[model samples]
Target: MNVAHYRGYEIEPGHQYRDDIRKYVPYALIRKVGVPDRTPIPTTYPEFYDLEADAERVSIACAKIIIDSHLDRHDQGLADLG
Candidate 1:
């Protein structure tokens, strides 16, 4: 898995942040997990909230790779550019 960091903070999947461009980026597999007819569907608002929470957790894990790699390259570039 890829990883990245910002200001020394590890960037994990679902690492929601206001980027320099102020755009939201979700970095995980957040789509519905099961097929439409395979499992009980979320019938209430709270259920949907719970599902989102779970998705955010997975996103954080997935985003860690990207964050770490970005930091690594950033450091290298700084050294070379300086």
Candidate 2:
């Protein structure tokens, strides 16, 4: 859902920042991890935590990459202006 109504905060950019963290903050998978990725929290909490944490890591990485790209250009614009 949109945390900021129709869009997210500028934080500094030409376009409003938009992020759905829930997408990345997963609970279970059907692939591989340290010991075969699986689902149902009933299977394991420790592994679940690991996977969820990894999801958050990925989310943050994605967010930062986009944010950095925008800010890099913005900063360059400021430099050019100066």
Candidate 3:
């Protein structure tokens, strides 16, 4: 598992080997630095990678996008009250 720090969140990026395709499928789990809950984010990319590092990289990128999107939405929600 590879960890990435992005936007005050810790992201764990990983990949599973698929026997059917003989490729690596990536996934990501994220949690706030001081928080206990680890949440899995969705990655909808249909293509699998040939290397574990490649898959993990994709997972990390996917997680960053999700985290930023959520934060942006929350900020906008708060600002809308102004």
lDDT of each: 0.35, 0.27, 0.62
Lowest-scoring 10 consecutive residues by lDDT in candidate 1? 40-49
Model 2: residue 16 alpha-carbon error in angstroms: 20
Q: Which digits, one per residue and each the tens of the lDDT, describe model 1 over residues 1-82? A: 4434433443333433334544333433211223312322111111122254554655564444333443566623122212
60: Cα error in model 1, Å:
1.6
Best candidate (score: TM-score): 3
lDDT of 3 by residue, 1-82 (tens): 4566776777778777657776667766666766535344434245777787888878778777667766676533212212
RMSD of each: 17.0, 17.8, 6.7
TM-score (all chains, Cα) for each model = 0.28, 0.25, 0.57
Best by lDDT: 3
What is the Cα-based TM-score of model 1?
A: 0.28
- Residue 42 C-alpha lDDT in model 3: 38
lDDT of 3: 0.62
